[PDB]
Amino acid sequence: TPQNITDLCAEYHNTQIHTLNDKIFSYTESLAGKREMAIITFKNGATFQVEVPGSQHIDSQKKAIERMKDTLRIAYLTEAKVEKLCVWNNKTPHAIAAISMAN
Amino acid sequence: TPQNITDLCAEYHNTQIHTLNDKIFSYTESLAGKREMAIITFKNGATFQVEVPGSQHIDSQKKAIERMKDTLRIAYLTEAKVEKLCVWNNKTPHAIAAISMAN
Amino acid sequence: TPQNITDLCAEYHNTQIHTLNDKIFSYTESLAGKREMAIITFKNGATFQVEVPGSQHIDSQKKAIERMKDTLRIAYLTEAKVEKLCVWNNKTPHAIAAISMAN
Amino acid sequence: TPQNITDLCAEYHNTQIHTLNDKIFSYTESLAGKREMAIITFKNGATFQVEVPGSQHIDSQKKAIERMKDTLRIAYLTEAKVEKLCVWNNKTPHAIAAISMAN
Amino acid sequence: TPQNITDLCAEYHNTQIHTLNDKIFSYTESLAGKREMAIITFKNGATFQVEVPGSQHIDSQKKAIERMKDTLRIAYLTEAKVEKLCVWNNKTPHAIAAISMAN
Ligand SMILES: CC(=O)N[C@H]1[C@H](O[C@@H]2[C@H](O[C@]3(C(=O)O)C[C@H](O)[C@@H](NC(C)=O)[C@H]([C@H](O)[C@H](O)CO)O3)[C@@H](O)[C@H](O[C@H]3[C@H](O)[C@@H](O)[C@@H](O)O[C@@H]3CO)O[C@@H]2CO)O[C@H](CO)[C@H](O)[C@@H]1O[C@@H]1O[C@H](CO)[C@H](O)[C@H](O)[C@H]1O[C@@H]1O[C@@H](C)[C@@H](O)[C@@H](O)[C@@H]1O
Ligand SMILES: CC(=O)N[C@H]1[C@H](O[C@@H]2[C@H](O[C@]3(C(=O)O)C[C@H](O)[C@@H](NC(C)=O)[C@H]([C@H](O)[C@H](O)CO)O3)[C@@H](O)[C@H](O[C@H]3[C@H](O)[C@@H](O)[C@H](O)O[C@@H]3CO)O[C@@H]2CO)O[C@H](CO)[C@H](O)[C@@H]1O[C@@H]1O[C@H](CO)[C@H](O)[C@H](O)[C@H]1O[C@@H]1O[C@@H](C)[C@@H](O)[C@@H](O)[C@@H]1O
Ligand SMILES: CC(=O)N[C@H]1[C@H](O[C@@H]2[C@H](O[C@]3(C(=O)O)C[C@H](O)[C@@H](NC(C)=O)[C@H]([C@H](O)[C@H](O)CO)O3)[C@@H](O)[C@H](O[C@H]3[C@H](O)[C@@H](O)[C@H](O)O[C@@H]3CO)O[C@@H]2CO)O[C@H](CO)[C@H](O)[C@@H]1O[C@@H]1O[C@H](CO)[C@H](O)[C@H](O)[C@H]1O[C@@H]1O[C@@H](C)[C@@H](O)[C@@H](O)[C@@H]1O
Ligand SMILES: CC(=O)N[C@H]1[C@H](O[C@@H]2[C@H](O[C@]3(C(=O)O)C[C@H](O)[C@@H](NC(C)=O)[C@H]([C@H](O)[C@H](O)CO)O3)[C@@H](O)[C@H](O[C@H]3[C@H](O)[C@@H](O)[C@H](O)O[C@@H]3CO)O[C@@H]2CO)O[C@H](CO)[C@H](O)[C@@H]1O[C@@H]1O[C@H](CO)[C@H](O)[C@H](O)[C@H]1O[C@@H]1O[C@@H](C)[C@@H](O)[C@@H](O)[C@@H]1O
Ligand SMILES: CC(=O)N[C@H]1[C@H](O[C@@H]2[C@H](O[C@]3(C(=O)O)C[C@H](O)[C@@H](NC(C)=O)[C@H]([C@H](O)[C@H](O)CO)O3)[C@@H](O)[C@H](O[C@H]3[C@H](O)[C@@H](O)[C@H](O)O[C@@H]3CO)O[C@@H]2CO)O[C@H](CO)[C@H](O)[C@@H]1O[C@@H]1O[C@H](CO)[C@H](O)[C@H](O)[C@H]1O[C@@H]1O[C@@H](C)[C@@H](O)[C@@H](O)[C@@H]1O
Ligand SMILES: [Ca+2]
Ligand SMILES: [Ca+2]
Ligand SMILES: [Ca+2]
Ligand SMILES: [Ca+2]
Ligand SMILES: [Ca+2]
């Protein structure tokens, strides 16, 4: 079991850490069919998504995907500082796997 | 996959972007049967709905519809600036497909 | 589809608009069996309920009843101004069908 | 249908109203198996639980028990004044049936 | 039934109470498959997890695991002082069973 987000990252292929140390600049959310997803951006210009749930996801991930969209929304609205994101770099925008918050 | 709301908009027929750059002026919600919906307005008079769930919606949209009504309520109560809305313009009021917030 | 709460209320028999333009004075909620409900009051003495789910309700109302109790709780805790309530005026207390918030 | 918590409490056997007129002093929550419960205290020493769901509860109460734990968590974090609790006074700690907030 | 966290802790093997009397320093959560977990730290370096749901958990714990992650996130975001954690000491990071907040 990992102790931090950087060690969690390293347990997967096609992932990387972004160190943002900043609040979320924009939050976008969609209910349009086949694009039920969220997108966030930071002022350094980087854009990330929470993927549309799909065949790449196992059943145990379904509640965690919804939790992640809830976390991004409330982090955006509280201007909470995002320390790091672990993302899959085989998607565009890069796909969020995990988030750490600290200030 | 789109990187922003405007590009997401462009993947659908009968949609348009409204640029509001303003907080929500009023938030209405209903539990009345066949009208289980939300309506929002802006100061300029613009009025939008989240549609009642129906046969137009695929299974993957059901939770995203509930999420959008959550998002509009907390945007209203935080006075969060709404940048853009993507809407279906073949409905009256215009029906929300996606929202972007930035301030 | 209606554009505001007054027009929505007119789509139903035995309903009434109350114009409160005030924040909720008191919020009460119960988990007691057969009384799983919420009650709000205004400082003028007006009292309203969200009804216990029952055979008067269709299945699409079940999520909207739970949402309405979530809305009343967060409205109460943010001191948000309630503009109007649409209610079934033949229930005692009057039973909430819809709410609009604006300030 | 009752109009206030005191009248609601009088529709049940083995219940009592406590008038606290104070914010929650501590909030405790557990995910330990057979002890999925919450406990709150007030600074006067009064201690209350939300019961572990069990065979004493009917299926309509499932959702309401989860809502009550959500209500006590946000009441505690907002320092919301609790007016009254309706409790089952034969359980130890006394078990919450309903809550009223007013200030 | 226990009346406080310490007494609850003592109903389980391999548990211990940690007295933190401090806010949460970092909050991490993950949707990556098989690592659907949360991790919190405190500024003295203490690190704790909410375990990935698994065959160690009974059905009644599913909801309470999800609630505990919700509680940690909103405690983090409100800088709520955590009084005590009850953890299992046979996992690394130590695994959260219960939390108390008081200030
Ligand atoms: C435009 C439309 O009718 N939308 C309905 C949709 O139809 C499908 C195809 O349209 C798109 C669409 O634009 O919506 C094409 C998009 O590129 C696509 N986007 C992405 C990223 O996937 C989008 C999505 O797949 C769906 O929205 C996901 O739910 O679908 C459309 O071209 C196709 O048309 C067929 C036609 O049906 C045939 O008769 C024949 O002429 O061949 C055409 C070409 O293939 O039909 C597709 C359906 O299989 O399907 C949706 C259900 O999957 C749904 O019916 C959708 O309707 C709209 O729904 C939104 C909310 O989801 C709003 O309510 C909006 O008002 C709806 O649009 C109206 O009502 C519909 C019920 C239908 O009567 C529409 O004509 C009407 O505009
Ligand atoms: C890299 C990859 O394709 N991942 C997909 C996964 O594949 C499994 C194994 O991969 C890992 C992983 O890195 O993700 C190995 C990690 O160590 C695991 N981590 C932990 C902590 O457990 C990780 C997780 O267990 C899973 O992600 C949880 O579901 O799995 C991978 O090594 C193995 O690969 C086989 C391959 O199938 C086979 O043909 C080849 O011959 O040999 C190799 C080596 O055995 O397959 C494993 C199958 O489970 O499988 C998942 C479904 O079970 C996903 O599909 C996952 O894909 C990625 O999902 C995430 C979301 O979770 C992102 O969307 C990401 O973009 C997905 O990856 C891309 O899309 C998928 C559909 C593939 O086409 C993939 O190649 C793309 O890169
Ligand atoms: C007035 C009424 O009977 N309401 C109940 C409803 O009845 C349907 C029709 O009623 C409306 C309504 O005004 O509520 C008509 C509206 O046009 C509809 N609006 C929209 C936007 O669609 C509305 C909705 O469809 C439903 O509310 C959502 O489910 O329904 C009513 O006029 C119609 O009457 C028939 C009659 O039965 C028939 O014999 C006669 O020949 O023709 C007329 C017209 O064709 O019946 C409809 C249903 O059969 O049905 C609902 C369930 O689908 C509920 O039972 C509803 O009752 C009220 O429910 C709300 C909560 O949603 C409150 O609890 C309210 O107190 C309920 O009303 C009281 O208690 C109920 C159980 C009845 O005793 C009612 O008479 C009481 O006032
Ligand atoms: C008092 C009691 O036994 N409560 C259990 C309940 O029993 C039903 C009737 O009780 C009330 C009640 O006060 O709880 C009576 C109220 O008028 C009802 N109010 C409303 C608004 O409807 C109320 C509710 O319907 C239910 O709570 C909803 O579930 O029920 C009780 O009077 C009745 O008694 C019969 C009796 O059994 C029979 O022998 C005699 O001849 O006639 C009388 C008159 O009718 O039995 C009813 C059920 O058959 O039933 C519930 C399950 O439906 C629970 O078991 C409930 O127990 C309490 O549950 C709450 C949580 O909801 C708390 O945990 C509380 O501590 C429980 O009470 C303890 O445990 C139970 C098993 C009893 O031993 C009781 O003595 C303990 O205090
Ligand atoms: C200690 C333990 O093994 N815990 C696992 C549990 O075992 C049950 C009994 O354990 C307690 C406990 O301390 O957890 C005893 C308490 O008195 C109970 N408290 C209350 C209020 O009820 C408590 C709870 O009932 C359960 O935790 C609720 O799920 O259970 C344990 O003593 C007993 O042991 C048997 C033994 O199996 C048997 O061969 C022998 O004949 O007698 C002894 C004594 O009776 O078994 C009980 C189960 O039948 O069972 C749980 C599933 O019901 C879990 O497996 C639990 O493991 C721990 O789970 C938590 C999360 O809930 C953490 O992940 C923790 O790290 C887990 O412990 C380790 O992993 C598990 C899977 C085992 O390998 C265990 O040995 C490890 O310590
Ligand atoms: Ca600011
Ligand atoms: Ca203002
Ligand atoms: Ca005030
Ligand atoms: Ca204070
Ligand atoms: Ca601070």
Side-chain angles (χ1 to χ4, degrees):
Chain A
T1 300
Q3 299 189 23
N4 61 57
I5 190 172
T6 302
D7 290 349
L8 189 149
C9 189
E11 296 189 285
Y12 298 81
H13 301 285
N14 305 128
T15 60
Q16 65 195 26
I17 295 287
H18 292 243
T19 300
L20 282 321
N21 291 320
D22 201 11
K23 70 195 75 170
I24 295 162
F25 179 82
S26 80
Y27 173 91
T28 298
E29 165 174 316
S30 165
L31 61 71
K34 305 303 190 188
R35 295 286 183 269
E36 306 93 345
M37 65 182 305
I39 300 165
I40 59 171
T41 73
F42 292 81
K43 195 218 211 148
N44 66 358
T47 303
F48 302 96
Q49 59 166 319
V50 177
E51 295 187 79
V52 177
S55 69
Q56 65 271 44
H57 297 116
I58 59 169
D59 279 344
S60 57
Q61 285 178 285
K62 296 324 164 80
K63 291 193 185 115
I65 290 156
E66 299 305 302
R67 168 174 315 277
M68 185 64 66
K69 292 175 289 200
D70 296 346
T71 300
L72 297 179
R73 180 180 58 213
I74 190 58
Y76 172 72
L77 295 167
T78 72
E79 297 197 6
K81 181 166 286 160
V82 175
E83 182 213 26
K84 288 165 189 308
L85 288 174
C86 171
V87 306
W88 289 280
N89 54 37
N90 65 347
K91 298 284 158 65
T92 304
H94 297 337
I96 298 166
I99 184 168
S100 63
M101 297 187 282
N103 190 197
Chain B
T1 293
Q3 305 186 40
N4 60 64
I5 186 167
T6 297
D7 294 343
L8 186 151
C9 176
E11 298 186 299
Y12 296 86
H13 295 112
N14 302 129
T15 58
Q16 79 187 68
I17 292 287
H18 293 268
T19 303
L20 285 312
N21 287 317
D22 200 10
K23 67 178 172 84
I24 298 167
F25 170 80
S26 78
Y27 177 86
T28 296
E29 101 190 9
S30 167
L31 64 74
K34 306 300 185 196
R35 294 287 191 270
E36 305 88 352
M37 70 187 295
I39 301 164
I40 62 173
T41 76
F42 293 79
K43 197 177 262 299
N44 68 0
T47 302
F48 307 93
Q49 64 172 305
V50 182
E51 286 188 87
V52 173
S55 57
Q56 63 275 41
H57 296 118
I58 63 172
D59 285 334
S60 52
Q61 286 179 287
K62 266 165 210 136
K63 273 203 217 80
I65 292 157
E66 296 311 295
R67 175 182 299 285
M68 182 67 68
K69 297 181 289 199
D70 296 341
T71 293
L72 298 171
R73 181 180 56 219
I74 198 54
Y76 171 72
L77 288 172
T78 60
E79 292 191 13
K81 185 168 130 209
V82 173
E83 178 207 43
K84 293 162 184 306
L85 291 177
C86 174
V87 307
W88 290 283
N89 57 22
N90 55 337
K91 293 285 162 60
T92 300
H94 288 183
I96 298 172
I99 185 169
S100 67
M101 292 180 286
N103 193 14
Chain C
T1 298
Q3 308 251 343
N4 60 61
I5 192 169
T6 298
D7 291 344
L8 195 158
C9 216
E11 300 189 295
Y12 294 84
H13 293 117
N14 305 131
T15 60
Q16 187 172 32
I17 286 294
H18 288 250
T19 307
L20 276 329
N21 282 314
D22 201 10
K23 35 188 104 294
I24 298 168
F25 181 71
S26 78
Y27 177 87
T28 299
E29 83 178 36
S30 164
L31 60 76
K34 304 191 160 175
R35 288 294 183 264
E36 309 90 341
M37 76 192 287
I39 301 162
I40 62 166
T41 74
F42 292 85
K43 96 98 126 135
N44 62 4
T47 299
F48 303 93
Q49 69 167 305
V50 181
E51 291 191 84
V52 179
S55 58
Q56 62 268 49
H57 294 116
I58 60 173
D59 199 62
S60 50
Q61 290 177 278
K62 302 207 183 272
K63 281 153 73 177
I65 287 166
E66 295 311 297
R67 173 183 299 286
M68 183 65 69
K69 289 172 296 189
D70 299 342
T71 294
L72 298 181
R73 185 182 52 211
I74 190 59
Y76 170 73
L77 294 168
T78 54
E79 292 194 8
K81 167 187 283 48
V82 179
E83 185 207 31
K84 291 165 191 288
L85 293 175
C86 176
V87 302
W88 287 286
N89 56 108
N90 293 344
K91 295 282 156 72
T92 303
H94 292 181
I96 296 165
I99 183 170
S100 61
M101 289 186 287
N103 194 20
Chain D
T1 298
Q3 303 216 25
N4 61 59
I5 197 174
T6 299
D7 294 340
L8 186 161
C9 220
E11 299 187 277
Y12 294 82
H13 292 303
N14 311 130
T15 54
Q16 174 174 224
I17 291 288
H18 292 256
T19 304
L20 285 312
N21 283 322
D22 195 17
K23 86 184 56 32
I24 296 163
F25 182 79
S26 71
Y27 176 89
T28 297
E29 154 192 313
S30 162
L31 59 71
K34 307 298 201 202
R35 298 283 186 267
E36 313 89 349
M37 67 186 292
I39 305 168
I40 60 169
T41 70
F42 292 84
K43 66 186 182 194
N44 66 355
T47 303
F48 301 94
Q49 59 170 316
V50 184
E51 294 187 84
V52 175
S55 63
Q56 62 274 44
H57 295 116
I58 65 174
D59 273 347
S60 59
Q61 291 177 286
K62 260 117 178 294
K63 277 209 213 127
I65 292 160
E66 293 314 289
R67 178 182 298 287
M68 184 60 68
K69 289 178 289 199
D70 289 350
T71 294
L72 300 174
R73 180 181 60 217
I74 189 72
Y76 169 76
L77 295 167
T78 61
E79 294 190 13
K81 185 165 294 176
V82 176
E83 173 208 45
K84 299 168 184 286
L85 288 173
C86 174
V87 305
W88 289 283
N89 59 115
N90 290 343
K91 294 281 164 68
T92 301
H94 288 178
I96 293 170
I99 181 165
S100 63
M101 296 189 285
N103 193 25
Chain E
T1 303
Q3 307 227 7
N4 60 60
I5 185 168
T6 296
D7 293 353
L8 191 141
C9 172
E11 296 193 287
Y12 295 90
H13 293 110
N14 311 132
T15 57
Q16 55 198 33
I17 291 288
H18 287 250
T19 306
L20 281 317
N21 291 318
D22 199 9
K23 68 175 175 73
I24 293 166
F25 177 71
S26 74
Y27 173 88
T28 300
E29 64 177 35
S30 157
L31 61 77
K34 308 301 187 189
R35 288 293 188 265
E36 309 94 339
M37 69 189 287
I39 303 173
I40 59 170
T41 79
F42 293 83
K43 70 172 196 261
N44 64 357
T47 303
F48 307 99
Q49 66 171 305
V50 182
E51 284 189 274
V52 175
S55 64
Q56 66 269 44
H57 298 118
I58 64 183
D59 180 67
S60 51
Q61 295 176 275
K62 285 180 184 83
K63 296 169 169 331
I65 291 162
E66 293 314 295
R67 177 181 297 286
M68 184 61 74
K69 291 177 297 196
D70 297 340
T71 291
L72 303 176
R73 177 178 65 210
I74 186 164
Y76 173 72
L77 293 172
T78 61
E79 293 195 8
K81 188 184 281 27
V82 173
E83 172 197 53
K84 290 169 202 284
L85 294 169
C86 174
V87 307
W88 291 277
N89 57 31
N90 63 349
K91 301 289 162 61
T92 300
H94 294 353
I96 296 166
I99 186 171
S100 61
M101 294 182 292
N103 199 357

